[PDB]
Amino acid sequence: SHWAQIKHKKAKVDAQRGKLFSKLIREIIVATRLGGPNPEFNPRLRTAIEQAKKANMPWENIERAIKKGAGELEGEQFEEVIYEGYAPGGVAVMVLATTDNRNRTTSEVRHVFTKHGGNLGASGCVSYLFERKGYIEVPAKEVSEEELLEKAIEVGAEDVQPGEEVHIIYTVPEELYEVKENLEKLGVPIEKAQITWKPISTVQINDEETAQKVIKLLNALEELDDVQQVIANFEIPEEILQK
């Protein structure tokens, strides 16, 4: 279950909503800038819109976000940037950010890494330790380990890992939406469907001291509005101590 920690079905559907919506708004903006404001020719946008609706984000905010990503070109500038660096214990970290000011975000990220004993590196310092994959989340509460494990295989997934709160399904990146579609067509609810990076191997970290620094670093990166996803290749002995 190495990092699938939303604590138990989302982090907080009350105090944390502004932050979550801010990130959903960014995804709609970038999906729009990347494949157009017309969802019919934009599967990513179709999915971003759906996730926003599922999270109870006002439809007026969803519409506003699409106009911002399309009415783009001067007066915005949101782009996706990938940061790569190392946390203590030799743990590799990729950070997927969507920002309107790269220099600003880079400094915020660099500060976070340094504060926690890590080090932001240059483009390419860790990506060879990960692979780009489709990532699908399905609510544990609503399905079963057994039924889901079978359906994942039935649709033809790359990798599956049960969860206490969420089950995770990985796919070939180009087949992310095809798999999502086939899973919903079989009755499986989808909580999230997005492109992510998956470690090709993990780094075992047994020093409880080091483990805590790694986790605080990752948590700190998550607290940045500019950050969409944080991925690391650590391997920690079943520990819930902290976020």
From Swiss-Prot:
In alphabetical order, the GO MF annotations are: DNA binding
What are the transmembrane regions? none
Gene3D superfamilies in alphabetical order = 1.10.10.200, 3.30.70.980
Coarse class of the primary localization is cytoplasm
Which GO cellular component terms, listed alphabetically, does the Swiss-Prot or TrEMBL entry include? cytosol
Q: Which domain of life is it from?
A: Bacteria
What does the sequence similarity comment in the record state about its family?
Answer: Belongs to the TACO1 family.
Q: What is the protein's given name?
A: Probable transcriptional regulatory protein aq_1575
Q: Which organism is it from?
A: Aquifex aeolicus (strain VF5)
